[PDB]
Scaffold this active site. Structure first.
Site, PDB file in Angstrom:
ATOM      1  CD  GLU A   7      -3.483   0.631   1.545  1.00  0.00           C
ATOM      2  OE1 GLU A   7      -3.748  -0.657   1.725  1.00  0.00           O
ATOM      3  OE2 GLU A   7      -3.970   1.146   2.338  1.00  0.00           O
TER       4      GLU A   7
ATOM      5  CG  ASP B 269      -1.210  17.867 -40.584  1.00  0.00           C
ATOM      6  OD1 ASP B 269      -0.697  18.557 -41.192  1.00  0.00           O
ATOM      7  OD2 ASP B 269      -2.224  17.075 -40.931  1.00  0.00           O
TER       8      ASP B 269
ATOM      9  CG  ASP C  36      -4.045  21.402 -34.252  1.00  0.00           C
ATOM     10  OD1 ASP C  36      -4.093  20.614 -35.254  1.00  0.00           O
ATOM     11  OD2 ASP C  36      -3.662  22.512 -34.120  1.00  0.00           O
TER      12      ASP C  36
ATOM     13  CG  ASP D 235      -6.869  15.339 -35.978  1.00  0.00           C
ATOM     14  OD1 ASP D 235      -6.737  14.619 -37.017  1.00  0.00           O
ATOM     15  OD2 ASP D 235      -6.169  16.591 -35.887  1.00  0.00           O
TER      16      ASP D 235
ATOM     17  CG  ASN E  53      15.989  -3.737   6.936  1.00  0.00           C
ATOM     18  OD1 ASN E  53      17.162  -3.925   6.469  1.00  0.00           O
ATOM     19  ND2 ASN E  53      15.555  -2.571   6.784  1.00  0.00           N
TER      20      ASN E  53
HETATM   21 MG   LIG Z   1      19.074  -2.952   6.448  1.00  0.00          MG
END
Ligand SMILES: [Mg+2]
Ligand SMILES: [Mg+2]
Ligand SMILES: [Mg+2]
Ligand SMILES: [Mg+2]
Ligand SMILES: [Mg+2]
Ligand SMILES: [Mg+2]
Lengths: 898, 898
Positions: free
Chosen positions: B331, B373, B641, B645, B709
């Site tokens: 998360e 274009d 544009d 398109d 770790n």
């Molecule tokens: Mg460490």
């Protein structure tokens, strides 16, 4: 007043950061009346046989190797003027330390504390030395940066030299200052002559000596002389001279003189050796230094007299007066300017704007009229649409082939038309023409006729002269025209029809270039300008040069800044008007060159202030217009990259050029843009305005604070029975305040101060000091009263508490007041300083607060402060800031900020 | 494996930052089969009398005032989709806190320390809350910035509303999401329909409904219906619909539905309401989260089992295992991405590149084929040279006047030709024509015929139809030509001559537009496309559109990056080839549209990988070419544009548009450039590559360190008789490390990582973790041995010394290793981080060092460290850095950095 000895006092900045370069095109009078030694040497060297030339300068045909080139450089010096060699760093440190103020401070310290009171004068001298090394480090770093920037864009030359240990020879591009006598170089079109040269070989070498001999037409330089001996050294057809350019052709030559030994090296350098009149910047700096000297020499002796009459010991009184006067020393200016402008220069080097000399940074911010040219700046250097047609309008291959021949067999400067013609011709026809035709002679381009010619031949029987140029000049020398495949005489009806068609094309924005061809019998003599007669007009080529996409926004930004853009171009008025209308510039009424010769100086100066577009201008016309545009209090900038733009660039208040250009347009310029664009110029102008505003703010704030301290000392010394602060503490305060102010060159500048061209008035500094001195003084008196009564420092026995009590107030307020007196707008909400400045302010304030509590305070004769003094100090600082904020409005109304 | 409950575990980012918008042009199938309620409501509202329309929606002719507009917004909701409303901040905080990991941590803390050991679980919950608020603050700030950026460029509408208290009415430009039902708006050319509309008045209103009804030709919308009632709601000639554009004409209408109540609001939003398949970014994020969940759920239970079997108390063992597993929580990704990409987006907003949704920042960095274009990007939108001539080549005023009439009396989109013709006509003739002619009807532009027509009249007797367009289309419908002032039939010889002349003009880069006029008797019926027959060709206008000065350097920079630029243009192949040659692009062999209809999908896909320039393309051809360019592992970006398109922009992997464009080209785009320039696009691509590299580096480093770790804890827990570190200390370490890493989004990225398009492989994170975990474990074991033997922490009674002994090693190394594992180049000499990152690293290191010596250490169960431990810690850190630096080479060789 008098004070002539101030010349001893004031130290002048090195003459390379400020003031321009010699620019060997000036003073057409006879300096040293062509001194006999130089003239005889040049005359003897001209007709010198080529064989003994190698032995004379110890030169070999293959070139020079390393040991030889350093030996020659040691023997004959360096290829620079005597004003261009920087001094050694130890000499700079000594001259910084040798100033009268520091020496007098040290002598007074020794005298005052020689009564067995050592480690006092020692610490005073230590502080003096620390300030001296601070100033020297600032100046040395900034000067090194400025010299590196000036060496980034320097004229280069192509030399033989030696590559690697194998002895292989190449063609090194080395700066001109590295040239030594007896060095072999090669010359091409557009490369200026770097030093006195003996031509070893030359292929149609035409050079422009209008700078020295005053003759606009290029002259021919040959490998061997072709004229009987003549006295005039500048007329030698085999020797080149520094300051001139190569109009056309190729050559390989040998350097025969360098540095001051060059012809121009004597001229105005040693032949005249007169005192050059200082420019605008040097005059302002001298005014500021003189004003500071006046204030110091007025107020310090009064303090000396008062303290000597009242306190007792005269020597300590003089030391104290000198210490307070050190705050207003005039020798801070050599650092300040150098510390500020160079910084901006470095920033300008990150905006594709190299500043050759720091002085320009002032004028580059004070510019309000920018003269330019349509090519490069407004429109691009590449043409999009081009059609090669005859007089009838139909496409003609003959015209394109003649233009291809002229462009391919030319040896002058490359042109957009030449590149377009070369690219638009198919490879098969181009190679057929190349293998079918061979070059013989070339008549280069000059403004008296504005036509270029090349004489080629398809055989040994007849030669074909092909010339091209502006329509009117070609038509002036054309008598026949190839119409419908037949050579018919060119009558008036065809002339008028051609004129109207080309006028319509010009009105559409198309530039028209006419081409003529002629056939002559084979001959051995060189073709002169008289051969361009009775030509056959093959046709004209119309090409479109589109305006740059960013030209209109850049012009709008420049007008918003206040820089009125004027166009000085030699093209037709129709094309220039169309380009100006395309880019949005208001052409108004156009003025041609032929309409300014009759006009007097006053008339032209009155018309140049209203006319925006000038067309059909000769270089003399451009120079005159630029010269007459500065008289009415206007700083004029000229932007150009042509061969003949050197007089215009030098005559303007500032000259701007491009990195890719002829050498004489770069030597004469003061600013070099890495790319030719107006947006870069506008951004550079804004940043230079910011830099100059920072420098002015630095000077104003430092002078005002130090003058306020001096005034407080002068007014409040009489009543007290001891020194208000020990001079050692004052030196500590000055050093720490300078360390804090170090970050000012990095300050932020409000857009209001840089929205208009800057005008610098040295007398405004005196008004600022007078206005902002007593403000600080009032609070100094308040702090004195607080220490005298509230804290009961009524006796000299407790004077140590008193002086330190002022010290923390003296250093912090002086440091804090900057954030109040740097902007006209309300600080910390409407305008803010830069992060380095705030960091330095906080750090220096912390150091000043902690100094009385530090163990060094005992050595510095500083006593610890009670905790009850902190609220009083905070209240004093807040009151000072609020009062100065409320008072700034009156200064804004009466005098104004900018 | 399975792990379906991971769907509960993984929290998905809001569907507005990632994934595109609905874009109401898709799914032409019958969603909800035109549900009877909506269809009946639309049918009843179409023929609704205008009088009761005011009462139905509580609307007045003058408009709506404030209280009414907020009342209507409250009653009918907001003009947004249900997926576009951001959640309230407290809801976001709750959903951040409600994650299983933090709740389980708090529950385990309460269970483990409920044995009268309060202030332990309390501090654990406090740390949990601090981490939760840190994550929430990061996400909230970044989402607010992203939403502000997306609202900066949003489609706007012109509304009546009420100005000031006086009740004065104006025309406010408000975002479409602020529209309420019963609001009066006005419609012009190029403005998309913002919501369901009832047309109050209409002047030649032609709208494009190809999005909904699938018919390419525009249809006419009138104030009152002109057709007998028909079932199909989309065919109503009086109701507009969201997602369609106004091709031509003007109108004033009233909003009758908004938000989800709109026709499209049901379509695919509620009519289908299906689960949208995640895009590339969401899939990669899900892969990363799943990999982290796998690693956590594999290793944490092993630690739990080992500690429970050996140590004793099972609850503390589970708490410790969860605490170490928190390091690899999935998360953190919702923050990380949002914290990084948004930052880049903000930086992109300072480079004139607005990013509507953060997902684009990935693709905008992964782009390698950019379709564009010629107009706007390559060449400018302003034409420099233009000449109006008849078929014979002579300038004709009739052609210019006809073009002026057509351009002035048109109501469609403004064109460069129209502006040039309007500017090139003198004011006198223009006003004479304006007062002499009056508009009657207009036949707009469509690609089936590519011609625009306007029918005007000088009187009430006869009408003149003036049409203009491409040469071939005009010639197809022309039978007569005005040659030499006489109307002569247009035979084949004149057709071929015109074709060859226009081909030569196209080869010169001139675009040619033909103009025809015809006279018809006066009639009341509207003019249709069938009226364009037997026309009189007045002539053609050739105009030059110059390429931009910065196009070639921008194309070179794009090619250096690796973005192959392809041109998809509907213009002639000659003009496109000339433009490409001018800008330096290699046209190679051109492919016209008529040559791709016969080609199959495979053939076109194998051809589009070698062809650079495509000419004469219809919008369907552009969409097909863009679609077939992505299959062979290429991320395609389309820049356009135009009106049509939208399919091309949506079908491309990324769509880039300009701020000034039609609404449908901005709604469909993912990136909006404030100015139409390729250099801005290239700089934005580089900066987006830097941003994505920063995000990947963040994820890699955090995952690798936390996995290391966890591995150290797993391997070394069995031998020790107590916990290697208290879980509270681990939470402190994680919080401080996250605070340090906060500055990573501001890191510097080497030019080597951003020199090529980025490819993101989620499986590479697992390899990186596996490679860099044991490296951080070996030194953890070394520190464990050092604390066990050297410092004699052999008993639980002195365990507090042991754990803290690891803590300082745990936090600092994890913080230091970043500077070693952020670049493949050697740190601090060949590559350096950014100042904020170094500042945060040093500050966090200082905090970690001072935590054991702080008074809080007693509360955190931390014991002071002896001075002899500092040299050992320094040696451990130096060895770790040196070993990882020497080991990075093997990872570079075997797998590679990028
Ligand atoms: Mg460490
Ligand atoms: Mg050269
Ligand atoms: Mg000759
Ligand atoms: Mg003071
Ligand atoms: Mg609009
Ligand atoms: Mg109609």
């Amino acid at each position: 007043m008098f004070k002539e000895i101030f010349t001893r006092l004031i130290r002048h900045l090195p003459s390379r950061l400020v003031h321009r370069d010699p620019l060997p095109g000036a003073q057409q009078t006879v300096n040293t009346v062509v001194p006999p030694s130089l003239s005889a040497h040049c005359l003897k060297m001209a007709v010198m046989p080529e064989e003994e030339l190698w032995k004379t300068f110890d030169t070999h045909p293959e070139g020079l190797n390393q040991a030889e080139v350093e030996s020659a450089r040691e023997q004959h010096g360096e290829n620079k003027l005597p004003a261009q060699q920087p001094s050694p760093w130890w000499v700079h440190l000594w001259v910084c330390y040798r100033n009268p103020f520091n020496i007098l401070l040290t002598i007074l310290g020794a005298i005052s504390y020689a009564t067995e009171d050592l480690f006092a004068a020692g610490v005073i001298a230590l502080m003096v030395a620390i300030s001296t090394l601070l100033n020297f480090i600032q100046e040395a770093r900034s000067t090194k940066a400025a010299d590196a920037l000036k060496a980034m864009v320097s004229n280069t030359a192509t030399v033989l030299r030696v590559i690697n240990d194998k002895g292989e020879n190449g063609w090194l591009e080395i700066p001109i200052d590295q040239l030594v006598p007896g060095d072999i170089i090669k010359l091409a079109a557009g490369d200026m002559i770097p030093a006195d040269l003996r031509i070893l070989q030359a292929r149609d070498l035409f050079v422009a000596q209008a700078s020295l001999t005053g003759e606009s037409l290029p002259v021919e330089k040959a490998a061997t002389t072709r004229q009987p001996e003549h006295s005039n050294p500048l007329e030698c057809d085999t020797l080149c001279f520094m300051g001139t350019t190569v109009v056309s052709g190729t050559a390989q030559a040998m350097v025969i003189a360098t540095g001051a030994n060059t012809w121009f090296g004597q001229l105005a350098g040693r032949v005249s050796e007169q005192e050059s009149e200082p420019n605008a910047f040097q005059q302002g700096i001298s005014r500021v230094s003189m004003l500071l000297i006046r204030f110091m020499l007025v107020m310090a002796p009064v303090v000396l007299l008062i303290n000597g009459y009242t306190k007792g010991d005269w020597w300590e009184a003089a030391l104290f007066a000198l210490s307070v006067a050190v705050g207003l020393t005039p020798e801070m200016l050599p650092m300040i300017v150098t510390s500020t402008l160079a910084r901006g220069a470095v920033k300008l080097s990150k905006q594709k704007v190299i500043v050759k000399h720091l002085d320009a940074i002032q004028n580059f911010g004070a510019m309000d009229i920018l003269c330019t040219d349509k090519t490069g700046t407004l429109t691009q250097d590449k043409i999009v649409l081009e059609n090669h047609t005859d007089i009838s309008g139909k496409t003609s291959e003959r015209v394109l082939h003649s233009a291809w021949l002229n462009s391919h067999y030319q040896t002058g400067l490359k042109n957009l038309l030449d590149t377009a013609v070369l690219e638009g011709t198919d490879e098969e026809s181009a190679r057929s023409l190349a293998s079918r035709w061979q070059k013989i002679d070339e008549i280069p381009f000059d403004f008296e006729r504005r036509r270029m010619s090349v004489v080629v031949a398809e055989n040994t029987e007849h030669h074909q002269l092909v010339c091209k140029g502006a329509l009117q000049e070609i038509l002036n020398v054309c008598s026949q025209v190839r119409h419908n495949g037949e050579i018919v005489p060119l009558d008036d009806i065809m002339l008028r029809k051609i004129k109207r068609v080309t006028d319509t094309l010009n009105r559409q924005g198309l530039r028209v270039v006419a081409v003529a061809t002629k056939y002559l019998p084979a001959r051995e003599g060189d073709y002169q300008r008289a051969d361009e007669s009775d030509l056959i007009l093959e046709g004209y080529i119309a090409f479109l040069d589109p305006p740059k996409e960013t030209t209109a926004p850049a012009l709008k930004a420049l007008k918003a800044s206040g820089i009125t853009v004027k166009i000085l171009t030699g093209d037709s008025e129709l094309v220039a008007a169309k380009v100006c209308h395309e880019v949005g510039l208001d052409a108004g009424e156009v003025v041609i060159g032929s309409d300014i010769e009759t006009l007097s100086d006053d008339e032209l100066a009155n018309l140049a202030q209203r006319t925006t577009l000038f067309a059909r201008l000769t270089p003399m016309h451009k120079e005159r217009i630029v010269t007459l545009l500065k008289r009415e209090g206007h700083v004029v900038g000229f932007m150009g990259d042509g061969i003949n733009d050197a007089p215009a660039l030098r005559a303007a208040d500032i000259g701007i050029s491009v990195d890719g250009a002829v050498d004489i347009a770069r030597e004469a310029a003061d600013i070099i843009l890495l790319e030719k664009s107006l947006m870069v110029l506008e951004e550079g102008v804004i940043e230079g305005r910011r830099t100059f505003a920072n420098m002015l703010k630095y000077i104003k704030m430092t002078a005002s604070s130090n003058f306020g301290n001096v005034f407080s000392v002068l007014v409040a010394s009489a009543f007290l029975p001891f020194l208000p602060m020990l001079p050692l503490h004052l030196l500590i305060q000055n050093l720490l305040y300078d360390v804090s102010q170090v970050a000012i060159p990095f300050d932020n500048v409000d857009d209001e101060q840089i929205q208009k061209p800057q005008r610098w008035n040295p007398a405004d500094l005196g008004r600022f000091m007078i206005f902002f001195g007593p403000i600080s003084s009032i609070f100094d008196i308040l702090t004195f009263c607080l220490m005298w009564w509230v804290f009961h420092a009524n006796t000299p026995e407790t004077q140590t508490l008193f002086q330190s009590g002022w010290f923390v107030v003296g250093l912090l307020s002086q440091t804090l007041i900057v954030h109040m007196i740097r902007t006209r707008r309300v600080p910390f909400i409407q305008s803010c300083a830069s992060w380095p400045l705030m960091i330095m302010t906080v750090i220096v304030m912390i150091v000043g607060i902690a100094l009385p509590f530090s163990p060094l305070a005992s050595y510095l004769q500083l006593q610890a402060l009670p905790l009850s003094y902190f609220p009083w100090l905070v209240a004093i600082l807040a009151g000072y800031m609020t009062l100065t904020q409320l008072v700034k409005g009156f200064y804004s109304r009466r005098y104004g900020w900018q």
